[model samples]
Target: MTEYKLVVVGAGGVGKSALTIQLIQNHFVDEYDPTIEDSYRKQVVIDGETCLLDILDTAGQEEYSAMRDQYMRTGEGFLCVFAINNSKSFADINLYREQIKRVKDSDDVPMVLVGNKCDLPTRTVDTKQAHELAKSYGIPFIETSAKTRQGVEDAFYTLVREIRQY
Candidate 1:
């Protein structure tokens, strides 16, 4: 079976782990665990192929920033997540994209821009901006709510497809 190492990254408190757990267990846990790294393997069939996604959920803290470069090197594709509820997190998305490009030594990387926390009605960041930025990065944009489980599967599957098509 084919597997893609999809790295989930973003600023802290942006529901990075929530999206991954929602995909693996269909349950959302709100607690923020600042673990160095925790990986989850999920077997899913996409595009008529049985594929596995090895998702890396890592710490977003400043102290753990050093680990980002190491993981970015091995990732086939990256899920750059940000909370639409917080503009601060959205701002950090650009930094993550640059780091990924630098670490991978290529701008032609498979990546997806994820706007999470769409369940919050008073969205501080506009999805339009998300669309425009992702367009600039030449990647797909998805609005997801880990709490409601909306767009969770699509976000992950799209990244898998991104890697496959690469």
Candidate 2:
């Protein structure tokens, strides 16, 4: 079995936990439930490959700045999540990316930009802006909806595949 350290991060209320939950449990929540705090860890199997994934679902609150380093320092890969419905979350992508850069020593660490909450098409943020932002940072981006399970699997598997290539 391979071990992979993954972190999901973004501004508050961007659906980081939603993506994490749906990725691990295959379910989505209708509302933002603060039941689980700080971070979560889980194990999963894909294509007969067993992987020990230490998932750090960081607090979106700015007061939890200290918690950011704990996860970022050891994370082998990252999913920088943002909500397609909220422009602020999308704008905060660089903050999360910078935090990762500070803790991760290698420039080659695998990562993907995830635009969550794609289920709400009416309140959509600019997809072109997302692509441009990710391109500026030299990372791939994918829009996903935990509610509909769209691109949820693709986001994770694509990160894994990128790691394999590297």
Candidate 3:
């Protein structure tokens, strides 16, 4: 059996957990609270392809850096998420990129810069910023909405397809 470990890393409240739940179960957590601090693991079948996806839904707060580092080391690829509605997250994308570089030691690994919460109309971060960040880092970028399921499946599928090509 082929197993794919994809780690979702970003600051807190970027909807990493929501994206995971949405993709895996096709449902969203209604009463989503930040107090529910736990990394989740789930299996998903996309297009008849059964994947044992180890989703490391991390906390965005200050205390989880070390834990986040450990999880990043174990994953094959990453979806480094940032919220388009929050400019602070867009600013911190460099730090998250550095964290991944520190843990993985290579920037060539398949990665997608995910701009989450696209359902929010008043976005502080724009597609140009996302594209610039990805261009500077030599990675791909896509906007996603966990709530609306917009580009959620495309994000994962794009990475999977990219990895398959190389």
Candidate 4:
């Protein structure tokens, strides 16, 4: 089976773990606990082909900065995530993108820009702005709600397809 490695990254409380859990287990987590690093594996059929997906849910704390390179190096695709209601989280997208490019030594790396927490009523970052950023970086942008499971499956499937192209 085809195997792909993917990493989910963002600031603390931006719901990286929640999104991962929702995708892999089809469950949503409400609490926000800091994650160091967690790995998940699953067999999924995308576009009529079954493949093994290995996902790494990374910590967003500053203390984990040193390990970012290692994670970037191992991942074939990435989900640079941010909370829609948090502008600070959205601002870190450039850092994550640059780090991935630097570690992979390629600007053409496959990645997706994700805006999580869409279920919340208030949003600090506008959807148009996020789309513009993704367009500027030549990457796909998607908004997802782990709670509602909206756009959750499409995000991972899109990344896997992008990885295949790469």
Candidate 5:
């Protein structure tokens, strides 16, 4: 009785598709694959319920604002991802999520804060910092490694859970 339209938002090189693809492909490929607004529909059940996950990702190398703007209005939930290796792009998450709220015209937007590239232990981003942000935003926070298939499922499924409650 549900369909989750989840958007993966992050600056280029943040590995939006890496985590997005990890869920469907169930594995990660270490390569640079440029994307342009990729969306996937997969049937899955969560907590004894059947639903469809419409996952959306954008071209990492291309800054297509309009491409994302069109999708923002209708996106039921979003995965605000950032590569732990780069803190500059992690700050980009703040901008992306803010626009989403304005576009959605509500503060109750469902989204998950994703700290990707958890495979890198010496990464710049501190989990405490990440946790602090998520706590302020009042959303769930998680660390994922698309390469290792860590927290990939939870990242998206968590969004679904957020959406179901609202």
Candidate 6:
């Protein structure tokens, strides 16, 4: 079976953990507590092929900033996440992408821009803006709701497909 290491990064409380858990564990977390780098493993089927996915869910807090480079260097693909309800978190997506590119030493690395919490009624970031930003970086963009499990699987599957192509 093929194996891939995917790192999930974003600002605090942006639902990175929630999304990861929903995909790997098939459950959603409702509480918000700062994370400190958690790893999860799962066997997934993509395009009629079985693959093992090792996902590192990174903390979004500032205290974990020093550890991000290490994660970035080891990750095969990335899901740069942000919450549609938090515009500031969305702004940091570029920083994550730049850091990954710098650490991987490749401009064409596989990645996806994810806007989480799509079920929220009070969205601060516009979908068009998020799509445009992903377009600028030549990466796929997806909106997901970990709470409702909307587009969550698609987001991770899309990243895996991108990684395989790379």
Best by lDDT: 4
For TM-score, the strongest prediction is 4
Residues 1-166 of candidate 6 have per-residue lDDT tens digits of 8888999999999999999999988889898677998999899888899999999999988787779887668899999999999989999988878878888999889899999999989999999999899999999999999999999999999999999888
- lDDT digits (tens) for residues 17-94 of candidate 4: 999999998899888588998999999999999999899999999899878778658899999999999999999999
Residues 37-151, model 2: lDDT tens digits: 4456666786678877677777788887776876468777889999988888887888878878877866657899999888895665798989998888788899898888899
Candidate 6 ranges beyond 4 A from true positions: none
The sequence of per-residue lDDT tens digits that candidate 5 reaches over residues 101-156 is: 88898887998999999998779988899999999999999999999988998888
Lowest-scoring 10 consecutive residues by lDDT in candidate 2? 32-41
How many Å off is the CA of 14 in candidate 3? 1.1
Residue 139's C-alpha lDDT in candidate 5? 96
Cα lDDT computed for each candidate against the true fold: 0.90, 0.80, 0.80, 0.92, 0.87, 0.91
Cα-based TM-score, every candidate: 0.96, 0.89, 0.89, 0.98, 0.95, 0.97
Q: For each candidate, C-alpha RMSD in Å?
A: 1.1, 1.9, 2.1, 0.8, 1.2, 0.9
* Candidate 1 lDDT for residue 89: 94
RMSD versus native structure for model 6: 0.9
Better candidate number, 2 or 3, judged by TM-score: 2
Question: With candidate 1 superimposed using the best TM-score fit, by how many Å does residue 69's alpha carbon deviate from the native?
Answer: 0.8
**Over all chains combined, what TM-score does candidate 6 have?**
0.97
TM-score of structure candidate 1: 0.96
lDDT of 3 by residue, 90-166 (tens): 89888988888889887777789999999888889978978998998887898999999999988887776555554
Write out the backbone clash pairs for model 5: none
Which has the better lDDT: candidate 2, or candidate 4?
A: 4
What tens digits encode model 1's per-residue C-alpha lDDT throughout 48-130? 99988888997778777778888668999999999998999999999999988899999979999999999998899987899
Clashing pairs in 6: none
